[PDB]
Amino acid sequence: EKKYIVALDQGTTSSRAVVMDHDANIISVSQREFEQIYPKPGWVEHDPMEIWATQSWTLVEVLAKADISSDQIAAIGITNQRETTIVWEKETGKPIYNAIVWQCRRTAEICEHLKRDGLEDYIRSNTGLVIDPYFSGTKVKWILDHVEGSRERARRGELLFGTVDTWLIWKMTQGRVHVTDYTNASRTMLFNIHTLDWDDKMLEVLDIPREMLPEVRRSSEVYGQTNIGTRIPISGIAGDQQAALFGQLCVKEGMAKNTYGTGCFMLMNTGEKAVKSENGLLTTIACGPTGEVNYALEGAVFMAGASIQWLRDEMKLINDAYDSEYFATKVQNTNGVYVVPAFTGLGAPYWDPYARGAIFGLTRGVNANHIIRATLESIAYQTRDVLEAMQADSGIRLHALRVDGGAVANNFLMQFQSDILGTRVERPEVREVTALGAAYLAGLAVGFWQNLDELQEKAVIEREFRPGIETTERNYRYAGWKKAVKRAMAWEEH
Amino acid sequence: EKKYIVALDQGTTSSRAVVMDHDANIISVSQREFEQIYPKPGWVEHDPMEIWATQSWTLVEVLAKADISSDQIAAIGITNQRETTIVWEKETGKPIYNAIVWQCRRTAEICEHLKRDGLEDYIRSNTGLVIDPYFSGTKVKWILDHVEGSRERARRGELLFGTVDTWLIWKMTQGRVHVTDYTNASRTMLFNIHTLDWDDKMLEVLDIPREMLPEVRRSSEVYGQTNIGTRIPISGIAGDQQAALFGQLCVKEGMAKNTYGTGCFMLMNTGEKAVKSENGLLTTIACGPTGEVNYALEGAVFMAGASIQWLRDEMKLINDAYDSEYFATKVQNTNGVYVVPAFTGLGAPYWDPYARGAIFGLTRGVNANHIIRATLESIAYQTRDVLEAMQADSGIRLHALRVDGGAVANNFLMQFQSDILGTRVERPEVREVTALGAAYLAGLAVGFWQNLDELQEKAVIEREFRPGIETTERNYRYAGWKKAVKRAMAWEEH
Ligand SMILES: Nc1ncnc2c1ncn2[C@@H]1O[C@H](COP(=O)(O)OP(=O)(O)CP(=O)(O)O)[C@@H](O)[C@H]1O
Ligand SMILES: Nc1ncnc2c1ncn2[C@@H]1O[C@H](COP(=O)(O)OP(=O)(O)CP(=O)(O)O)[C@@H](O)[C@H]1O
C-alpha cells in the first residue's frame, strides 16, 4: 500500500521536500525560496512563518505534483539549517521575533563577556563547542533580554523555544509535541553531550528558563503524527549536516564527508566517543547507524558557495555560479592572487570574528578571471586547512575524501581540491545526500528499512578525483595561502 | 613664416604630439596608445619600436590634421616617461631588449646587494636618489649581465644606452645626436647631481661602460635638426613630471604641483639649493625660471589613474574612466573597504618593492561600487602620505595644493582629495600643463618666447576645492588607510 517516504528540508535560503520509492529513488521534488533578512550588517533573520509556509507548500506540491496520496507514504524524515533559533508564544503559537540564523553575528558582544570569565573549557568541554555567535545559546539570550515579558512568560512556561526542526514540528503536530534531536540539540551550546542533556551551567549562565526547552529525542524515532490527510509519521530528525553525513552513510568511526554548500562542513565519525578538538574543530553529536547518538568531529567554514554568489550577485563578474568554471579555466592559474572569504570573519580552524574578506597579490595584468578562480581555490584551501586539524585531532589518514554539495558539480573545483589535499576525492552518484539521511533515518525508524546495507547501493560513487600536482606544487600554494589568511585576520577593530 | 611649436610627449601608455600658437594655444593633438608588456608579475616592458613608431606618428597627424607644414613650426619640445631604459645596437640601430619601465620591479635583488654593500648614503647623496628598482642604473645592468656580448660591444662602444628622450632623438636625428638633459639624466641613479656628470662610483660599481652613455645637456638648448621635411629643431627636454612643473610655472622655492596621471608625482621647487629627504622623498633636478637647473623635492606614486584603467580594462567594472565618478557617488561611502594599488610595489614614502595590490575589509554587502570608490579614494590617501613628507622635508605648510593631470577632471576625487588633506585644491584652467612646459623650454630655447611672464597669464585657476570634512573623519580614515598599507607591505617572497 504505502510506497513512499517524505524528506523535508528546511535550508538556509529555501524550503524543500522530497519523495522516494523503497528502492530509495527520488520520486520527486518541491522547492520554495524564502527571504534572506539582513536587518543590519552581520545580521540575519528569517520569517519563522516564511520558513514554515514555504516548506508546507513544498510538502504538498509534491503529493499532488506526482499524484501520491497520504495513504502511500510511510513517514516523514526532517532536516535543517542549524543554529537558527526560534521562540514563540505558544497559546498564540506565534513568534515573538524572526529567527536568527547561525549566520548572524549580532551576538558577538556576549561572546566576549563569556569569554573573559574563562568559560572556554567548560563550553569547549561540555558542548564540544567553542565561544562564538555561531551557536544559539547567545542568540536566545539576545532575545530574552531584548524582549519584555519574555523571561517571565518564559519562566511561567508561557514562551517556547525551538530550532528550525523544533519549530517545524510543533506546527505539523499542531503544538502537540515539543522535541528536538541530539544532533540538533547539540548545536545550541547549552547541552551536555556526554550527558545528553540541557546544562544548568549554561542554562543559568546564559540565563534561560528550563521551561521553553523541548524534549530532546533520538534522531531515528517516532515523535508523532501529522494530519496532512490521514495521519503521517515523523520519525526523522538531524541537522542537515548530520543528515548528509548519514545520507552519505558515514556511519562508523573515520567515515567522513565534505559538504560544499553555502559554507563548508566537513564532518567525521567517532562513532561512539566524543573526541576533543585540540586544533579548533568541533566535537559534536551525530547519528549512529540506527538514529542513535554518535560523535563527530566537525570543521565548519563560513564562506563557500556564498563567495561565488557574491561574485555573481554583488560583484557581478558572472551570471551563473555555473559560469565560474568556464572563466576559471580561461586562465592558466590565479596569477599570484589569493582571496580570503572572511566576509563573516573566520572559523574552523581559526575562529577569528574580526577577520574580513580580502583580496591579495595584485598586479597590473591580473583580471576578473584570475579573481574568479582564486575565489574558488579559496574554497579548497579552507577544506585542507581544516582537514589538517581533523587529521591532527583524528590521528587518522584519509586517502579518500567523499564529498557532497552544490559545488561538487564544479569539476575544476573538484579536481583542484584533490590536487590540493593530495587526496583522492569521491563524488557520489546521487546528490540530495542530505534528504537521503532524513528520509532513511525516518523510514529506518519505521522498519521501512531493516538495515542500512540495503540503501548501501545508492552509494555509488560516480567520480573520483585523483591528485595530479606535485608535492612541491602543493605546499607551494598552501604557503602563500596562509600568508594571506594571516593578513586577513583581525581586521575589525576591537 | 613659422607660427608654431610642437611638443612631443612620450608616456607610460601612449605617445602624444601637441601643436600650439604663439599665444600658446593648443592648436592640436595626435595620440596613439602602445602595449603594456607584463612579461611576468611585477614586470613591465615596452617596445622601443612600438614606442618609436607610435611616437613617430602622433606628430605626423597632428601636423596633417591641422594642415600645418614643417615650415611653420619653429621647433620641438620633448617629454617622456622617466625611468624606462633602453639599449641598442647602433650600426644596426636596434634594441637588444625591450624597454624596462620605471614601474618594473625585476631588479630588486640587485638592489638588495647594493643595499648590503652599504651604498645608500653615497647614492642618497650624489644622486638625490634612493635604492630602488625604480631607477635605471640597476635596470641597465640587469640587461647587461643578461645579454651576451654586451659588456664587450658595450665597451667597444658598439652598444648604446638611453632614456625615452635620448632614444627618441637618436631616432629623429637618425643617429646624429646622443644626448639627454639633466632632469632626465638625474633619474638614472648614475649621475652626480652636484657635479652634473656621470659618476664613476656607480659606473663601475654597476659595472657600466662610459661608452654607451649619452651626452648630458641643458633642458632648453638646441640639440639638432629634424628632417621631417625641412629641418626642424629639438630644443627642449624634461621628464614628463618636471615638465609639468614648469608648465604649471612652479618656478621658485615653495612652488608645488601635484600631478595626477598614470602615477602621482607631487613635486616641489627648492631651486638652487637642494634639500635632502628625511622622509623617503627624492631630491631632484628641476628647471629654473630660465630653463636653468633647480632642485626639487619629489614624492612618486606608482599607481594612480592606472588603478582606474585596471578597473576598466582588466577588471572591467566600468567602460569609462569617466564612469568612475558616477558610480562612486552611487554610494554614500566605501563601506570600510580599503584598497592598495601596489601593483608594482610601493614607492614614496614607503619604497617597498615587495608590496602587491590589495583589497581590504570586505563584507557581504560590499559591492562593485564600493570597490570602485575605494580605488579612487586610494588615490587621495597616497597624495596625503606624500605630501606630509613633503612638509616634513620642506619645513612648510601649504595651504593650497595646485594640481594637474588626467584625473583632475574628477571632482569627487578632487573634493575628497581636499577633504582628506585639510587643504585647498586649485584646478587650473589649462590642462596640457605638461606639453605646455616642453613646448615653452623648446621655444624658450629659440627666442620663440623670451620669458614666461608672457605665458604667465595662462595660469588661471578655474576650480577651487575646499575641504568639507571634519578633522576627526580625516584622520579616522587616514588611520584605516595606514592600517591597510601595512598589511600589504612585503607580500612578495624574497
Ligand atoms: N557549478 C557550481 N560551481 C561552483 N559553485 C557553485 C556551483 N553551483 C553552486 N555553487 C554554489 O552552490 C551553493 C548552493 O548549493 P547548495 O544548495 O547545496 O548549498 P546550501 O544547501 O548550503 C544553501 P541552503 O542551506 O540555504 O539550502 C551556492 O552557494 C553557490 O554559490
Ligand atoms: N574621470 C576620471 N576619473 C578617474 N580617473 C581618470 C579620469 N580621467 C582620467 N583618469 C586617469 O587619468 C589618466 C590619463 O591622464 P594622463 O594623460 O595625464 O596620464 P599620463 O600621461 O600622466 C601617464 P601616460 O603619458 O603613460 O598616459 C589615466 O591613467 C586615467 O585612468
Ligand SMILES: [Mg+2]
Ligand atoms: Mg541544506
Ligand SMILES: [Mg+2]
Ligand atoms: Mg604623460
